[PDB]
Motif scaffolding. Sequence first.
Motif: not given
Lengths: 322, 322
Positions: A95, A98-99, A102, A117, A191-194
Amino acid sequence: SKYSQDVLQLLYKNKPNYISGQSIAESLNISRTAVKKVIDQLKLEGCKIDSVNHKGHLLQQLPDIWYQGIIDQYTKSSALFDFSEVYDSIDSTQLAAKKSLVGNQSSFFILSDEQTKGRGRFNRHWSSSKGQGLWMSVVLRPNVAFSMISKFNLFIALGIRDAIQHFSQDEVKVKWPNDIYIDNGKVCGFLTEMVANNDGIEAIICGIGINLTQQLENFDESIRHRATSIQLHDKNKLDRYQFLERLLQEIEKRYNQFLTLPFSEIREEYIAASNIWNRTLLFTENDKQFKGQAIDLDYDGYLIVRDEAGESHRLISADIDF
Amino acid sequence: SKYSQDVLQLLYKNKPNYISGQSIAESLNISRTAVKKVIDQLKLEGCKIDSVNHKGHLLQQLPDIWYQGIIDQYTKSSALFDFSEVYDSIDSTQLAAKKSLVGNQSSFFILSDEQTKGRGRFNRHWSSSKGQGLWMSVVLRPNVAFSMISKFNLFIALGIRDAIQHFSQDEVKVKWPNDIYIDNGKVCGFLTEMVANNDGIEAIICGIGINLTQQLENFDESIRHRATSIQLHDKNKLDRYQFLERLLQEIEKRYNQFLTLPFSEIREEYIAASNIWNRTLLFTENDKQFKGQAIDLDYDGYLIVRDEAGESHRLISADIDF
Ligand SMILES: Nc1ncnc2c1ncn2CCCCNS(=O)(=O)NC(=O)CCCC[C@@H]1SC[C@@H]2NC(=O)N[C@@H]21
Ligand SMILES: Nc1ncnc2c1ncn2CCCCNS(=O)(=O)NC(=O)CCCC[C@@H]1SC[C@@H]2NC(=O)N[C@@H]21
């Protein structure tokens, strides 16, 4: 203390030599008395610092706590990682990555001693025991096409596996597509997010959780037979800083491989390190679930599966259980 | 004032009836004297509020400023939008949406009267003149596959076009894949980004910029011949609140179409509204650039192109100039 990390960083950077308290003071423009007070505090927090009368101080060993001033030394010497954020406790390093990503194009990672969490794939709960594992999220900026992005997981899996293998007396295997196992126990998942559109990728965020020193009793009764830690497979005391260094080195090496080599060049290596073969697997696809066998791994990194009805499948990804 | 938005919201919600200042006071648990002071301030900011001696107050017209208390009324009556953030000035509503979406599953939008760092596709600068356009980012939670996500732009384009068309005396056309034109002028561009992995989509963020009341002189000399605003094609004074209502209604309608109908059901409609046909186009692909003609739009929303060398292409996306 405000200068505690800076004192720690000077001690780390000067290994294996002693540094006088006076030298630390002139570097930080603080008093000799403030330096000795910081060193006492660090000793209180479990830093093993040898102090001899005319020589000064030598950092001998860190406790099982992440320290910004130490990690700062890692990012200064890394071509890839611009910076890092080191937290004692956080909802989730993912989390926070991802903030933090930006509005900038920085490559960096975020470490926390504990997560309240932690989340895995499909928002499954992830246990992040304080002081017992590496909970980290890595933000990178691959300038690549979507036909290529799924390969990152295949390369990064091999880096994590090698990092762990360096400290495990037992064989460390990869469960496609994002699990690291030691014998029958899950020691890591990632876990890979984009953030992306059809014009390109703004960032990837790879969330890596690795169990370092959990005793079996430290795992919840629900995961104890399927979870393991590096310490449970190491005759020596696992040092989280030595491991983090090795892990950052392998991540860097495999990320540059991912940007410069087709998956074909690690395909054999990946197959040889996998543990999904010659073994029936449980596939979950929304509400349905079926069984199958892993037949092959093609040149694009797709798993070729024979399901229980005899049909073949070419899967860019899946969630499979043993 | 702290209760200024709440007074505004009560005035809006009671249209077309007058409400006494006493009634506003009992609703907000403040004094009759505080209510009249708020109403004076709102009049100072350009709210046209009719006040008659024994009846109370009637909101007649809002100024060209976004007001949280009004937008709040829009989200309360929207099944889709959980909430909104209304800013007077911001670096970018897109940057703010990407931060605000983390750690929750809310659907919402972010509005700002001005942007200091508006960005279009490929990080091209976007001019966000204060008080003259709608600068907004929409965060939605489509539970859909990647083979389906690119269609969102095709559906949303038709909603924006219809919203603008309701206020334009001239024909509003769509330039695939993310431009809205009035005659030869770009009146809107939008940009859709996603947070995703192979397991699914965490969110999409659709950044929508629409020129509302720019005079030609209000556009930079570099874009003046290729930019236009709704007011430049409307005989009446464009009302930004009336337009925003229509725009939210069309976005909602087209988003639900996108979740329930294949692109084939709007394909003819989309073709009929496009302005890219019978016309040579300029394609940019990294360092190369070529010319081509738009031959067709297939059933998946892919543009079929004949380039100047005579080769055919099937493009999920592209950046094309006239
Ligand atoms: N400690 C555990 N050890 C072994 N097994 C466990 C453990 N806790 C739960 N189980 C069982 C369920 C396994 C969940 N299913 S999964 O999603 O397929 N597996 C994954 O590994 C993806 C999770 C990545 C975690 C990282 S931590 C830093 C970052 N921040 C954040 O929030 N996430 C990422
Ligand atoms: N005011 C303008 N009117 C007409 N032309 C213009 C204007 N300014 C620049 N030009 C020319 C270059 C056009 C740029 N090339 S583009 O990327 O293909 N076109 C796009 O429309 C994508 C941009 C979407 C903007 C929204 S605003 C809210 C949200 N927040 C944020 O930062 N972005 C989104």
